[PDB]
Amino acid sequence: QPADGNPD
Amino acid sequence: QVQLVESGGGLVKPGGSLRLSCAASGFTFSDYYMSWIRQAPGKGLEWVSYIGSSNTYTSYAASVKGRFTISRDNAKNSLYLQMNSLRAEDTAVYYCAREIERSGWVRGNDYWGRGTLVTVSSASTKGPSVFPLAPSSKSTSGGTAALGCLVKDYFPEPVTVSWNSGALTSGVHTFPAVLQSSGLYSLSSVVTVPSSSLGTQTYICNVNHKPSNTKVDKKVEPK
Amino acid sequence: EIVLTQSPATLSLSPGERATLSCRASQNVSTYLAWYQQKPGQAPRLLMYDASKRATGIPARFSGSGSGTEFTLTISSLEPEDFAVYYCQQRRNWPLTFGGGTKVEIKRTVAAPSVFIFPPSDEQLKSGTASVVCLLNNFYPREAKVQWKVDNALQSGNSQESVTEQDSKDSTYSLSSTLTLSKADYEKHKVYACEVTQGTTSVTKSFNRGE
Numbered sequence: 001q002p003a004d005g006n007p008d
Numbered sequence: 009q010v011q012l013v014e015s016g017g018g019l020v021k022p023g024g025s026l027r028l029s030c031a032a033s034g035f036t037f038s039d040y041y042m043s044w045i046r047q048a049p050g051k052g053l054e055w056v057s058y059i060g061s062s063n064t065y066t067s068y069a070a071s072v073k074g075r076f077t078i079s080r081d082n083a084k085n086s087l088y089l090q091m092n093s094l095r096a097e098d099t100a101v102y103y104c105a106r107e108i109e110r111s112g113w114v115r116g117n118d119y120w121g122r123g124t125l126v127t128v129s130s131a132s133t134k135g136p137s138v139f140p141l142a143p144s145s146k147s148t149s150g151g152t153a154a155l156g157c158l159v160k161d162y163f164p165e166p167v168t169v170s171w172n173s174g175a176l177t178s179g180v181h182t183f184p185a186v187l188q189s190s191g192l193y194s195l196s197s198v199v200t201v202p203s204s205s206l207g208t209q210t211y212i213c214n215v216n217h218k219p220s221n222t223k224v225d226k227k228v229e230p231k
Numbered sequence: 232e233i234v235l236t237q238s239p240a241t242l243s244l245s246p247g248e249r250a251t252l253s254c255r256a257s258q259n260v261s262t263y264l265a266w267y268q269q270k271p272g273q274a275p276r277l278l279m280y281d282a283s284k285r286a287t288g289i290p291a292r293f294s295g296s297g298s299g300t301e302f303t304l305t306i307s308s309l310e311p312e313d314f315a316v317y318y319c320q321q322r323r324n325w326p327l328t329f330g331g332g333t334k335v336e337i338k339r340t341v342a343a344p345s346v347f348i349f350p351p352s353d354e355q356l357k358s359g360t361a362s363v364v365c366l367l368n369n370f371y372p373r374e375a376k377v378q379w380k381v382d383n384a385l386q387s388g389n390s391q392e393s394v395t396e397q398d399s400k401d402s403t404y405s406l407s408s409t410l411t412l413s414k415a416d417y418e419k420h421k422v423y424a425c426e427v428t429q430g431t432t433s434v435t436k437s438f439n440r441g442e
Binding site: 117 | 232263265267269274275276277280281286287318320322325326327328329330331332345347349351352354355358362364366368391392393394395405407409411
């Protein structure tokens with residue numbers, strides 16, 4: 001998923 | 009080669025705390041993102057947490073939110089999992105695993121550590137009692153004899169079992185342990201042999217319990 | 232959360248046969264799906280990511296396909312080393328989730344167990360506890376009903392069983408069942424029996440405490 005750890 | 013080595017696992021009381029470490033080598037740790045994945049005994053895989061470029065970028069499974077914290081120290085090539093308010097249901101092997109990244113999205117775990125076992129229980133460490141499963145000299149199974157060792161009331165996992173210091177391997181079945189209602193583990197190890205061998209060949213089971221730094225050797229004599 | 236279902240949970244196939252493993256998602260995950268292999272006592276190994284990209288060093292007999300909610304992992308011809316558990320993992324959104332796994336075991340002919348029953352050792356009885364152990368040696372298939380009878384009374388709630396992984400040489404399983412009782416309970420009864428039922432056959436192994 002988004003690599004910053006935040007849901008899409 | 010890429011290597012990931014977890015450490016810090018062990019026994020913890022319910023409500024206690026534990027810190028896992030994961031040492032990375034064979035690649036530039038700071039060029040990769042990481043996850044922790046756990047596996048309860050006999051169960052499937054459960055993702056635990058993920059970290060990106062720094063402690064600023066993390067994500068957690070709902071079941072651990074607020075209790076576990078993932079972090080990294082690139083100068084030490086190390087990943088960490090701080091575990092607080094532990095519960096019996098957290099008992100599992102914990103793996104650290106490297107993530108695949110492309111186009112700003114992580115896409116799977118291409119390298120895994122060997123895992124470290126975390127046990128959450130009020131039980132105290134205890135070495136095993138090893139009892140014989142003795143073969144009957146009277147053979148009632150077509151000329152074959154079964155014998156073994158009952159490894160009872162040890163804690164925590166794991167134990168390993170060999171026979172005659174590794175010289176006897178054919179026909180050995182060492183069973184996965186069961187967790188007894190007492191909170192202690194028990195397992196058996198068996199081997200089938202020619203009944204005609206019971207009077208000539210010595211059979212010894214070698215039971216190693218590293219958590220208690222105890223090894224038990226039990227000679228199993230015919231009945 | 233995105234729920235993954237792997238059905239069937241077990242595939243029983245012969246070496247050289249084609250294997251088709253399914254993973255279905257409760258929501259649209261596009262092609263963000265990874266597949267893993269795991270053997271007993273070992274860490275998982277990545278096989279496939281982005282649904283269809285083979286991982287490093289994975290043989291070409293493994294191919295992944297699908298998009299959206301239905302995905303497949305195909306092993307064109309099973310090799311001995313391919314009998315293992317397979318998990319899918321969706322990488323579409325946080326939190327990450329896994330399927331429950333599919334075990335690919337070796338199909339073989341039916342094989343009845345050799346059944347042995349072990350009384351408690353005198354050494355253990357001195358401790359005030361008794362463990363009675365029943366062994367089912369090298370049988371197939373894995374499914375079997377094991378029951379304890381004490382003076383012909385069916386037991387419930389006082390036994391636990393364990394099963395080995397499939398044997399690499401003969402593809403059988405073995406099973407242990409352990410009955411736990413106090414020394415006093417043990418000495419109140421004579422006949423101890425372990426009954427194994429598979430299909431239309433029950434085999435009971437027993438001993439008399441005195442003998």
